[PDB]
């Protein structure tokens, strides 16, 4: 019993981690096979970020002027390349630490974890969802960019997100592996809007279904609703629109917990409607939206992982 | 910016997690140096749970019946013992992987992380704190005993905590890493009283100055507060007496955020008399006491590990 935001065990990702030095800028970089990822805005000083032309500045730097410490080794850089908003940085040793690993781009509304760094170095691990607007709510100081997000599958590590920019309004923004911002944003000191941030309704839904399996359900109610009634409700309210993909999703934990998908979603609506009363539930005052359907099976039931 | 429920990174001790059966029991053990630890509710059948004599049980077993796997390789058990409610199995082979570490005794109100493993694998790490009442509220399924909690300076894990029991309540109960239990629990299949769950006085104020930190202040109020005052108005909430030990321990981030500390108890005494008004502090809407100050600093301030 109990339900918990868990992280994944953070083993294979921190014999990944290194320091990336250039200039005076210090930040993280991913070491895997002979090569190191990191944020192309270890190139910049504080000024060059309120405008940077990352080409014109890039040309500037030889391959000796990037540092790459792992623990207290420094390792020879052999080559560099920008991709996208990303550095690659060929180095002439494999990281013997290396896990199978793959790259991933994942969708709003997805979850994974932090693994938040200093100087090459692990200062904690955290769950987090991408949210529909393709900001993250981290936890993030000065100096914890190339920090990577990932999931794991048995051994297998997929690397979804690498840390970039905290935005003026102190949410977080970056890229995919391949260098690629999720939503609209730019690596420059700029104000950037993220539009609404909506609340992610299957994620909810998957967590109600949690708290039926731990035996929380003062909350399931005598109604049921259909899609489009559910959804008018989920515009008012901010919610993302509920689809038959969604419906499909959590039909493994429909089928455990004999509760249709509608029913609990005229539940969801009743207590958008009505809020919680003072009441709780899984130890929350509001409705939760960083658990998918994956990540609730994954905990009633226990996966481990190498 | 931003502020997480933040866990130690898992590396360290997801190198020690293995496999311990006896007969047709499988839970988790600790292997450290040349010893194992677990539960010694490993050698019971769920027969056996309603009412162990371990000393009886423990004698019908011989270092052969042991059964101790560390991945794919058996270790070979050379001795056995009981040391209150764990057992230490002696292997002929020192984890190579052993990191600098301690065993401790925990204070109520203290946090931790929790490895959850199931058949010596981990499943996923996450922030806990330990009760007043000595319970945690866990996440754990059957065969997760012998999952540890733990601390880590530096490059020293301090393990304090070893699980073995779900209450009927559904919450969580073990031992340190010399088998005592915390609180009044037995290792026995029974009921069992947990008194009354206090919240943790100290560890809500830090919270509150984390939000001041963070800009989160709406609920700053105009009053200020005496101990005893407070700790009238604590006492109706069930909320742990607060006394100067705690005052002097929040001295550091009332030096941050230049709100003295009788300034933020009247404020929490606001908060607990009318409630939140449907606001959120943090992103939660009630009020969270599962981070210390020492881990409000260590999170404000990007403490790393190695």
Same mark, same amino acid.
């Given at each position: ?175 995919? $592996? @391949?260098?690629? +911002?999720?939503?609209?944003? /730019?690596? =420059? &000191? ?96 509001? $409705? @939760?939206?960083? +658990?998918?359907?994956?990540? /609730?099976? =994954? &905990? ?7």
């Amino acid at each position: 019993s109990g339900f918990r935001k868990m992280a994944f065990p953070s083993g294979k990702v921190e014999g990944c981690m290194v320091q990336v030095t250039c200039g005076t800028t210090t930040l993280n970089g991913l070491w895997l096979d002979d090569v190191v990822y990191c944020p192309r805005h270890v190139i910049c000083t504080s000024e060059d970020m309120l405008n940077p032309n990352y080409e014109d500045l890039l040309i500037r730097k030889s391959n000796h002027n990037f540092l790459v410490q792992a623990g207290n080794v420094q390792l020879r850089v052999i080559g560099h390349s920008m991709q996208n908003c990303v550095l690659k940085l060929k180095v002439d040793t494999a990281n013997p630490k290396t896990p199978k690993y793959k790259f991933v781009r994942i969708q709003p509304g997805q979850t994974f974890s932090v693994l938040a760094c200093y100087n090459g170095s692990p200062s904690g691990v955290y769950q987090c969802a991408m949210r529909p607007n393709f900001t993250i709510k981290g936890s993030f100081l000065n100096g914890s960019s190339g920090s990577v997000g990932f999931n794991i599958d048995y051994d297998c590590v997929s690397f979804c997100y690498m840390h970039h920019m905290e935005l003026p309004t102190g949410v977080h923004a970056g890229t995919d $592996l @391949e260098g690629n +911002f999720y939503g609209p944003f /730019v690596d =420059r &000191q700029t104000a950037q809007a993220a539009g609404t941030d909506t609340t992610i309704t299957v994620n909810v839904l998957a967590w109600l279904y949690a708290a039926v399996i731990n035996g929380d359900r003062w909350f399931l109610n005598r109604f049921t609703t259909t899609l489009n009634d559910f959804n008018l409700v989920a515009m008012k309210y901010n919610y993302e629109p509920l689809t038959q993909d969604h419906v499909d999703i959590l039909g493994p934990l429909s089928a455990q917990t004999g509760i249709a998908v509608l029913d609990m979603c005229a539940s969801l609506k009743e207590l958008l409607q009505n809020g919680m009363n003072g009441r709780t539930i899984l130890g929350s005052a509001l $409705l @939760e939206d960083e +658990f998918t359907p994956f990540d /609730v099976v =994954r &905990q009633c039931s226990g996966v481990t992982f190498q």
